[PDB]
Amino acid sequence: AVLHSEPLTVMVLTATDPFEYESPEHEVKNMFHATVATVSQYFHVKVFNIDLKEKFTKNNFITISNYFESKGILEINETSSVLEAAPKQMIEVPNCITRNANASPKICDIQKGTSGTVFYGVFTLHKKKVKTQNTSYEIKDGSGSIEVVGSGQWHNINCKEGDKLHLFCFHLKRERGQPKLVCGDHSFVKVTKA
């Protein structure tokens, strides 16, 4: 994880509802996921300061400093600064950036990933098996299928075949070559019915 002290102005694209997670100090706290954009790139952002939720509203322009980067994902916590951006610091985000930010990876391309990489996306549920301590969600698209393993509040998620699972910050792991996505401390799932 690398510290970025230089101010960076972005436009907020999306943000999730807050949800509970376990903090590094092993206390229940709330976080949310966001995507933001400059004129040339979008970024996934993990926000660990629930007081910033209003700032992370679609189309808000914000300037972030003293944030961190890990696996290409930005981390904003209590020691970070997030202020509204000044007018002359704002630059129009090309629609092509926003479309790319909204696109999901193909499962065949997730299957190519190195162990430890992180993935986000929306995928159709094919089958699920609720086990004693975790749940395996087999997700599918035209390019292949992959097992997603959820535990804790991502175990026994209320969903059915054909629903869409929106996955945030899942981790690729390989067991005997076979890749799968597993949840981590800052994963999030939402379900859209279909």
UniProtKB/Swiss-Prot annotation:
Per the record, GO CC terms?
A: nuclear periphery; nuclear speck; nucleus
GO biological process, alphabetically ordered: activation of innate immune response; cellular response to interferon-beta
Localisation: Nucleus
Upregulation details from the record are:
By lipopolysaccharides (LPS).
> What range(s) does the HIN-200 domain occupy?
1-192
- The answer to whether keyword Transcription applies is yes
Q: Which residues form a coiled coil?
A: none
* Organs and tissues of expression: Mononuclear phagocytes.
Which UniProt keyword terms apply here? Nucleus, Repeat, Transcription, Transcription regulation
| Origin: domain of life | Eukaryota
Q: What is the similarity comment for this entry?
A: Belongs to the HIN-200 family.
> Subunit details for this protein?
Interacts with HOXB2.
Its biological purpose is as follows: Inhibits cell growth via p53/TP53 and RB1-dependent and independent pathways. May work in synergy with TP53 to promote the transcription of CDKN1A/P21.
* Protein name, UniProt field: Interferon-activable protein 211
The root-end lineage is: Eukaryota, Metazoa, Chordata, Craniata, Vertebrata
Q: Which residues of the full protein are shown?
A: 222 to 415 of 425
